[PDB]
Amino acid sequence: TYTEDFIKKQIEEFNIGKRHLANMMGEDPETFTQEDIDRAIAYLFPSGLFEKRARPVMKHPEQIFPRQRAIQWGEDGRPFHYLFYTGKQSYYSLMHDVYGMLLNLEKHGSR
């Protein structure tokens, strides 16, 4: 399991490694981007493995490691969303919005 401190240290390491890679490739570290990181890592570590995921990768720790839940209530205990106790706050919020849009109208190649 990946504790948040581990992810924080990974983020710091990625930032320092990004500045190192920009130093190596002669580019300005400030404007150095993820496309630039991909190009530089493809040049420095050439790999013709057919699997694009078996090739060397230098990604942000957020992207490469999985994600976790979000906090749904603060220290006072009150949930942030008014539809929290449904257990499907996002879905029912979306349905509520759609129904309101339909009510407003009633008053008035792709998949």
Binding site: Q72, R78, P79, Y82, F84, Y85, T86, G87, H96
Partner: protein, 220 residues
């Protein structure tokens, strides 16, 4: 902190009507909203008999003089709970008013559940929300019956979790477990709109009063 408790939380309980909920409504207003119109005599529930003025051509009439006192007590309790920053959860399975109730709950900064009630929201909350979830301090039923004309499971679950309940109870409903029942019509849109207006206004004024009193206490 003792002075804070005494001046903020204990003071409002010393007054009969601290938030002045009595001027939000009157018997004439409830009459104009058709709050007195109940179901037919054949659908009458026994425990709703004491609240019924009579039966007008096989149609029950809800005594509004009792509704006034019951609504006064319910609105006072709701205002006091909102002043105490308690979580308030409106519940209603009447799909004609789901949108209105959700809008009202969002407006007064409280919570709504107008959808299918999955087994164990309240009794099994720790597994379904998390080990540290906070349950509502008060539940307001605008409709106490589900769509098969049987009590909402949330009534019994709220009794089990020792959560006080306010409820609008029609002539065919069971008020035995609602802590603060309000006999009234819950079908006609006018009555439901009136209930939503009253409860929203009470909660909002209670919150404003809480902020005002805290600010005054801090200044002095």
């Amino acid at each position: 902190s003792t002075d804070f408790n005494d001046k903020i939380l204990n003071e409002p309980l010393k007054h009969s009507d601290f938030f002045n909920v009595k001027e939000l409504f009157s018997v004439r207003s409830l009459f104009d909203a058709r709050v007195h119109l109940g179901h037919k005599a054949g659908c009458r529930h026994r425990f709703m008999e004491p609240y019924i003025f009579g039966s007008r051509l096989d149609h029950d009439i809800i005594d509004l003089e009792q509704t006034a006192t019951h609504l006064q007590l319910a609105l006072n309790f709701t205002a006091h709970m909102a002043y105490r920053k308690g979580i308030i959860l409106f519940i209603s399975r009447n799909r004609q008013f789901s949108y209105l109730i959700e809008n009202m709950a969002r407006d007064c900064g409280e919570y709504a559940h107008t959808r299918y009630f999955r087994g164990g929201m309240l009794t099994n909350a720790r597994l379904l929300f998390g080990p540290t979830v906070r349950l509502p301090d008060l539940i307001i039923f605008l409709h106490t019956l589900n769509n098969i004309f049987e009590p909402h499971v949330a009534v019994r679950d709220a009794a089990k979790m020792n959560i006080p309940t306010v409820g609008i109870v029609d002539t065919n409903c069971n008020p035995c477990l609602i802590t603060y029942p309000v006999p009234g019509n819950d079908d006609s849109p006018l009555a439901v709109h009136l209930y939503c207006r009253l409860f929203q206004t009470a909660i909002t004024r209670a919150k404003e009063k809480r902020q005002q009193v805290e600010a005054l206490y801090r200044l002095q």
